[PDB]
Scaffold this active site. Structure first.
Site, PDB file in Angstrom:
ATOM      1  N   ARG A 212       8.820  17.373 -21.699  1.00  0.00           N
ATOM      2  CA  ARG A 212       7.805  17.565 -20.635  1.00  0.00           C
ATOM      3  C   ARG A 212       8.259  16.790 -19.411  1.00  0.00           C
ATOM      4  O   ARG A 212       8.541  15.577 -19.504  1.00  0.00           O
ATOM      5  CB  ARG A 212       6.477  17.045 -21.136  1.00  0.00           C
ATOM      6  CG  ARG A 212       5.374  17.357 -20.197  1.00  0.00           C
ATOM      7  CD  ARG A 212       4.736  18.690 -20.523  1.00  0.00           C
ATOM      8  NE  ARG A 212       3.917  18.587 -21.733  1.00  0.00           N
ATOM      9  CZ  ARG A 212       4.062  19.320 -22.841  1.00  0.00           C
ATOM     10  NH1 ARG A 212       4.988  20.287 -22.928  1.00  0.00           N
ATOM     11  NH2 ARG A 212       3.294  19.121 -23.888  1.00  0.00           N
TER      12      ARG A 212
ATOM     13  N   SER B  33      -3.273  -9.230   8.619  1.00  0.00           N
ATOM     14  CA  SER B  33      -3.559 -10.550   8.498  1.00  0.00           C
ATOM     15  C   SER B  33      -2.825 -11.334   9.511  1.00  0.00           C
ATOM     16  O   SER B  33      -3.348 -12.284  10.061  1.00  0.00           O
ATOM     17  CB  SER B  33      -3.372 -11.049   7.033  1.00  0.00           C
ATOM     18  OG  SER B  33      -1.988 -11.300   6.772  1.00  0.00           O
TER      19      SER B  33
ATOM     20  N   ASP C  91       6.456  -4.296   2.500  1.00  0.00           N
ATOM     21  CA  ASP C  91       6.491  -3.661   3.858  1.00  0.00           C
ATOM     22  C   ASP C  91       6.165  -4.622   4.955  1.00  0.00           C
ATOM     23  O   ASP C  91       5.616  -4.193   5.946  1.00  0.00           O
ATOM     24  CB  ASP C  91       5.576  -2.448   3.930  1.00  0.00           C
ATOM     25  CG  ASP C  91       4.106  -2.792   3.836  1.00  0.00           C
ATOM     26  OD1 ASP C  91       3.733  -3.930   3.340  1.00  0.00           O
ATOM     27  OD2 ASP C  91       3.201  -1.981   4.200  1.00  0.00           O
TER      28      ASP C  91
ATOM     29  N   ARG D 276      22.237  23.164 -18.107  1.00  0.00           N
ATOM     30  CA  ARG D 276      23.119  22.201 -18.807  1.00  0.00           C
ATOM     31  C   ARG D 276      22.508  21.487 -20.023  1.00  0.00           C
ATOM     32  O   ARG D 276      23.133  20.593 -20.554  1.00  0.00           O
ATOM     33  CB  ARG D 276      23.706  21.259 -17.891  1.00  0.00           C
ATOM     34  CG  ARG D 276      24.608  21.866 -16.829  1.00  0.00           C
ATOM     35  CD  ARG D 276      25.218  20.851 -15.875  1.00  0.00           C
ATOM     36  NE  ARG D 276      26.019  21.488 -14.835  1.00  0.00           N
ATOM     37  CZ  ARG D 276      26.562  20.842 -13.813  1.00  0.00           C
ATOM     38  NH1 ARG D 276      26.398  19.532 -13.691  1.00  0.00           N
ATOM     39  NH2 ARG D 276      27.276  21.503 -12.911  1.00  0.00           N
TER      40      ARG D 276
ATOM     41  N   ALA E 115      -0.168 -23.473  -4.172  1.00  0.00           N
ATOM     42  CA  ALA E 115       0.920 -24.259  -3.564  1.00  0.00           C
ATOM     43  C   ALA E 115       0.466 -24.815  -2.203  1.00  0.00           C
ATOM     44  O   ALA E 115       0.796 -25.960  -1.855  1.00  0.00           O
ATOM     45  CB  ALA E 115       2.197 -23.461  -3.487  1.00  0.00           C
ATOM     46  N   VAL E 116      -0.283 -24.055  -1.414  1.00  0.00           N
ATOM     47  CA  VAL E 116      -0.808 -24.550  -0.121  1.00  0.00           C
ATOM     48  C   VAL E 116      -1.733 -25.737  -0.432  1.00  0.00           C
ATOM     49  O   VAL E 116      -1.606 -26.808   0.203  1.00  0.00           O
ATOM     50  CB  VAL E 116      -1.611 -23.465   0.616  1.00  0.00           C
ATOM     51  CG1 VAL E 116      -2.347 -24.115   1.814  1.00  0.00           C
ATOM     52  CG2 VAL E 116      -0.714 -22.385   1.101  1.00  0.00           C
TER      53      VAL E 116
ATOM     54  N   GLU F 255       4.031   7.516  -2.645  1.00  0.00           N
ATOM     55  CA  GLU F 255       2.874   8.120  -1.980  1.00  0.00           C
ATOM     56  C   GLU F 255       3.050   8.294  -0.481  1.00  0.00           C
ATOM     57  O   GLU F 255       2.339   9.145   0.102  1.00  0.00           O
ATOM     58  CB  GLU F 255       1.635   7.261  -2.280  1.00  0.00           C
ATOM     59  CG  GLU F 255       1.696   5.854  -1.736  1.00  0.00           C
ATOM     60  CD  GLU F 255       0.424   5.033  -1.924  1.00  0.00           C
ATOM     61  OE1 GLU F 255      -0.554   5.476  -2.543  1.00  0.00           O
ATOM     62  OE2 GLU F 255       0.454   3.906  -1.473  1.00  0.00           O
TER      63      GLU F 255
ATOM     64  N   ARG G 251       2.315   2.490   0.156  1.00  0.00           N
ATOM     65  CA  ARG G 251       1.807   2.789   1.522  1.00  0.00           C
ATOM     66  C   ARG G 251       2.918   3.652   2.206  1.00  0.00           C
ATOM     67  O   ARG G 251       3.203   4.797   1.734  1.00  0.00           O
ATOM     68  CB  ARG G 251       1.324   1.577   2.312  1.00  0.00           C
ATOM     69  CG  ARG G 251       0.492   2.018   3.524  1.00  0.00           C
ATOM     70  CD  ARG G 251       0.021   0.808   4.304  1.00  0.00           C
ATOM     71  NE  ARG G 251      -0.872  -0.012   3.507  1.00  0.00           N
ATOM     72  CZ  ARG G 251      -2.161   0.210   3.299  1.00  0.00           C
ATOM     73  NH1 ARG G 251      -2.785   1.221   3.854  1.00  0.00           N
ATOM     74  NH2 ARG G 251      -2.874  -0.630   2.487  1.00  0.00           N
TER      75      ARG G 251
ATOM     76  N   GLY H 293      -4.868  -6.079   1.142  1.00  0.00           N
ATOM     77  CA  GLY H 293      -4.907  -5.747  -0.302  1.00  0.00           C
ATOM     78  C   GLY H 293      -4.340  -6.919  -1.097  1.00  0.00           C
ATOM     79  O   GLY H 293      -3.283  -7.480  -0.783  1.00  0.00           O
TER      80      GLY H 293
ATOM     81  N   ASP I  70       0.515  -7.297   7.535  1.00  0.00           N
ATOM     82  CA  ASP I  70       0.482  -7.240   9.054  1.00  0.00           C
ATOM     83  C   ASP I  70      -0.788  -7.460   9.729  1.00  0.00           C
ATOM     84  O   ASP I  70      -0.806  -8.223  10.727  1.00  0.00           O
ATOM     85  CB  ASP I  70       0.966  -5.849   9.463  1.00  0.00           C
ATOM     86  CG  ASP I  70       2.486  -5.686   9.368  1.00  0.00           C
ATOM     87  OD1 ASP I  70       3.236  -6.684   9.225  1.00  0.00           O
ATOM     88  OD2 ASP I  70       2.916  -4.523   9.631  1.00  0.00           O
TER      89      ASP I  70
ATOM     90  N   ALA J 185      14.941   7.462 -13.404  1.00  0.00           N
ATOM     91  CA  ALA J 185      14.321   8.673 -12.847  1.00  0.00           C
ATOM     92  C   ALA J 185      15.406   9.537 -12.338  1.00  0.00           C
ATOM     93  O   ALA J 185      16.246   9.086 -11.538  1.00  0.00           O
ATOM     94  CB  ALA J 185      13.324   8.332 -11.773  1.00  0.00           C
TER      95      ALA J 185
ATOM     96  N   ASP K 151       3.637  -3.852  -1.577  1.00  0.00           N
ATOM     97  CA  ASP K 151       4.363  -2.729  -0.983  1.00  0.00           C
ATOM     98  C   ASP K 151       5.754  -3.093  -0.394  1.00  0.00           C
ATOM     99  O   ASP K 151       6.526  -2.208  -0.140  1.00  0.00           O
ATOM    100  CB  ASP K 151       3.508  -2.139   0.144  1.00  0.00           C
ATOM    101  CG  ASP K 151       2.152  -1.555  -0.283  1.00  0.00           C
ATOM    102  OD1 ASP K 151       2.079  -1.026  -1.390  1.00  0.00           O
ATOM    103  OD2 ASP K 151       1.217  -1.582   0.588  1.00  0.00           O
TER     104      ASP K 151
ATOM    105  N   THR L  29       1.820  -8.734  -0.497  1.00  0.00           N
ATOM    106  CA  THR L  29       1.586  -7.277  -0.700  1.00  0.00           C
ATOM    107  C   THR L  29       2.499  -6.763  -1.789  1.00  0.00           C
ATOM    108  O   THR L  29       3.616  -7.234  -1.944  1.00  0.00           O
ATOM    109  CB  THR L  29       1.860  -6.387   0.575  1.00  0.00           C
ATOM    110  OG1 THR L  29       1.606  -5.054   0.278  1.00  0.00           O
ATOM    111  CG2 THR L  29       3.210  -6.629   1.149  1.00  0.00           C
TER     112      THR L  29
ATOM    113  N   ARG M 131     -12.399  -6.504   4.317  1.00  0.00           N
ATOM    114  CA  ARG M 131     -11.912  -6.019   5.631  1.00  0.00           C
ATOM    115  C   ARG M 131     -12.767  -6.499   6.751  1.00  0.00           C
ATOM    116  O   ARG M 131     -13.952  -6.673   6.583  1.00  0.00           O
ATOM    117  CB  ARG M 131     -11.810  -4.468   5.672  1.00  0.00           C
ATOM    118  CG  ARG M 131     -10.822  -3.929   4.679  1.00  0.00           C
ATOM    119  CD  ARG M 131     -10.689  -2.426   4.497  1.00  0.00           C
ATOM    120  NE  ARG M 131      -9.813  -2.207   3.295  1.00  0.00           N
ATOM    121  CZ  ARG M 131      -9.506  -1.019   2.746  1.00  0.00           C
ATOM    122  NH1 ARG M 131      -9.984   0.076   3.320  1.00  0.00           N
ATOM    123  NH2 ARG M 131      -8.722  -0.951   1.614  1.00  0.00           N
TER     124      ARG M 131
HETATM  125  O1  LIG Z   1      -6.948  -0.555  -2.282  1.00  0.00           O
HETATM  126  P1  LIG Z   1      -7.066   0.806  -1.381  1.00  0.00           P
HETATM  127  O2  LIG Z   1      -8.025   0.631  -0.131  1.00  0.00           O
HETATM  128  O3  LIG Z   1      -7.381   1.982  -2.189  1.00  0.00           O
HETATM  129  O4  LIG Z   1      -5.610   1.118  -0.573  1.00  0.00           O
HETATM  130  C1  LIG Z   1      -4.528   1.635  -1.325  1.00  0.00           C
HETATM  131  C2  LIG Z   1      -3.278   1.128  -0.629  1.00  0.00           C
HETATM  132  O5  LIG Z   1      -3.220  -0.313  -0.740  1.00  0.00           O
HETATM  133  C3  LIG Z   1      -1.979  -0.700  -1.383  1.00  0.00           C
HETATM  134  O6  LIG Z   1      -2.235  -0.669  -2.823  1.00  0.00           O
HETATM  135  C4  LIG Z   1      -1.553  -2.088  -1.028  1.00  0.00           C
HETATM  136  O7  LIG Z   1      -1.302  -2.108   0.378  1.00  0.00           O
HETATM  137  C5  LIG Z   1      -1.047   0.500  -1.120  1.00  0.00           C
HETATM  138  O8  LIG Z   1       0.082   0.584  -1.957  1.00  0.00           O
HETATM  139  C6  LIG Z   1      -1.977   1.675  -1.197  1.00  0.00           C
HETATM  140  O9  LIG Z   1      -1.543   2.801  -0.300  1.00  0.00           O
END
Ligand SMILES: O=P(O)(O)OC[C@H]1O[C@](O)(CO)[C@@H](O)[C@@H]1O
Ligand SMILES: O=P(O)(O)OC[C@H]1O[C@](O)(CO)[C@@H](O)[C@@H]1O
Lengths: 322, 322
Positions: A164, A105, A131, A213, A22-23, A224, A173, A11, A103, A188, A129, A127, A72
């Site tokens: 609301r 990749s 992660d 209160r 930069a590369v 998610e 992810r 993604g 990962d 939040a 995420d 990414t 992909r």
């Molecule tokens: O772009 P897609 O295939 O809908 O995948 C969504 C997923 O990709 C990401 O946006 C990036 O890894 C995640 O946060 C999300 O779960």
């Protein structure tokens, strides 16, 4: 190390163009020829591989997305498919490949370094995420964090006007970092993340007590990787009846001009990847760890959640107090 | 540690409200009463000191500036003036003071801990300029960085349309960090900072050579701690005649809603300051160093430039290549 290639896979994230730039610029500075590979690993297979010049990366540092594109390529799991990729690189005399992505990749780049003696590979973590191991922060996280903050700051205006409650779904992810950082940032009152046991009853109790209160509404920010916002809403409704709405922020979190942190991190990592290739290194993912630029073997990467920060965010919530 | 006070001193920065909010909410979580001191150290002298409740910091995390205000107090250098401040704190039974600001602010807090046995003091680094020791990043730097990036990205549109070179002055007092980080982020072809020897001739030569190579315009980003943009313009004109404009970004860099990095850092530091007070600590400034939250004595603080990052930014400049 006279010729290198670069690709983006997985993604897209804001800052991937700064990393490619930069590369490119670091390679050309060192009199190395650079090739762009388009559409990720699909490009290796289709031979969509083109020499880049200094001007090819002008007007890109500020741009979101990836100008190389990503597509992909699950068939890269077949060793026979990989041989075609390797030959498309080797036909041109390419000696080093930089992969920007996640990962997956990195798994491809690990195969390439194993199956072609003449190619070194280095991975750069891209990414939203956060992660990927080998780094405390991935390229795109800071940008996505600020995207979520902007969106939720807007939601808060309308929440406040109408008393609301909103249940807001963030990306990530299976990682709760975006939800944690953004949730603390927007105040939040509840943050739901996959790294912590989920207790919807508890959350309902806190919300109900708030109402007792005079805290009339709140924001629930839901990673998610835990559950959908709509699921959270349905589960809460077992315990309490409040006036609420669901928001799924979605792919907006993937886009936009990268923040300064992302442009600087991407630039640092892209230049370091080229330096590692020149130094004879392979099969490593780069990153920033404890504010130092580092490289980690893919093995160690394959083989982070800040519970203290989560604790803080809860202490700061007026619902934790009520 | 039953009663604490908090104040903001020195130039305001985005994220100071998030820091005040975290001190307030963390203190109240721990059943500590919190007092706001308004207008910085002037507030101590004028006794503009008021108890804060949980609601006093609602609707503040996203807001720039400081809701406590800041005002200069050079007379705090007199020990007789300080005694009045100390008594205004001690009249209320205050046992801990958190100061959010810069070096000056920390000097006052150091005097207070020395001159009042019964008061512990802790400093939190708040400035856009990134020029406080005991931390790798100050609260407000990330925000100001992104402010400059947004402004210069706009300037670049008009520069490009007209092939017009801009000489842009950034804030930072005597620190080049803002100019370096922003300059790398916007692809500035030249960055002028006080930490590196200034060679205007050299810069002119690079620019002239660019023109020879068909690079018609560029951005020069100048840290005010080196020289003014207008001075840079005048000095360059000794060597080359180009079509240029000067931009002084100014106080816009001080304002705005804090970014996620600033809201999270401010929150972490504010909560940690309260924790340090509870633990019996004094005369320390907090920070993030190598991605860890730390505390450093004011002595060690009083008693950072990333030349490697500067080197990278120059390698990435097409003028360094031309
Ligand atoms: O772009 P897609 O295939 O809908 O995948 C969504 C997923 O990709 C990401 O946006 C990036 O890894 C995640 O946060 C999300 O779960
Ligand atoms: O707000 P003033 O008094 O004009 O001071 C300007 C200075 O303050 C800062 O904005 C913050 O310290 C500096 O970057 C700048 O040199």
């Amino acid at each position: 190390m006279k010729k290198i290639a670069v690709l983006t896979s997985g993604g897209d994230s804001p800052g991937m163009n700064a990393a490619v730039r930069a590369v490119v610029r670091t390679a050309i500075y060192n009199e190395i020829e650079v090739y762009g590979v388009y559409h990720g690993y699909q490009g290796l297979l289709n031979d969509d591989i083109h020499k880049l010049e200094l001007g090819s990366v002008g007007d890109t540092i500020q741009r979101g997305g990836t100008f190389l594109y990503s597509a992909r390529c699950p068939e890269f799991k077949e060793q026979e498919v990989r041989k075609v990729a390797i030959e498309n690189l080797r036909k041109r005399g390419i000696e080093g490949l930089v992969v920007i992505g996640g990962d997956g990749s990195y798994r491809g780049a690990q195969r390439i370094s194993e199956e072609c003696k003449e190619i070194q590979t280095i991975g750069i973590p891209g990414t939203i995420d956060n992660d990927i191991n080998g780094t405390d922060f991935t390229i795109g996280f800071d940008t996505a964090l600020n995207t979520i903050i902007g969106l939720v700051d807007k939601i808060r205006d309308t929440a406040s006007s109408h008393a609301r409650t909103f249940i807001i779904e963030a990306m990530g992810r299976d990682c709760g970092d975006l939800a944690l950082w953004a949730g603390l940032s927007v105040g939040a009152e509840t943050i739901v993340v996959p790294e912590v046991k989920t207790d919807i009853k508890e959350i309902a109790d806190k919300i109900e007590q708030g109402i007792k209160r005079g805290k009339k509404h709140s924001i629930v920010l839901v990673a998610e990787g835990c559950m959908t916002a709509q699921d959270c809403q349905k589960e809460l409704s077992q315990y309490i009846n409040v006036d609420n709405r669901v928001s799924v922020l979605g792919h907006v979190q993937r886009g936009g001009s990268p923040t300064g942190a992302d442009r600087v991190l991407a630039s640092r990592l892209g230049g370091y990847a080229v330096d590692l290739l020149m130094q004879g290194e392979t099969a490593k993912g780069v990153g920033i760890k404890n504010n130092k630029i580092v490289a980690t073997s893919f093995d160690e990467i394959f083989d982070k959640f800040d519970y203290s920060l989560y604790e803080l965010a809860n202490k700061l919530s007026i619902l934790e107090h009520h």
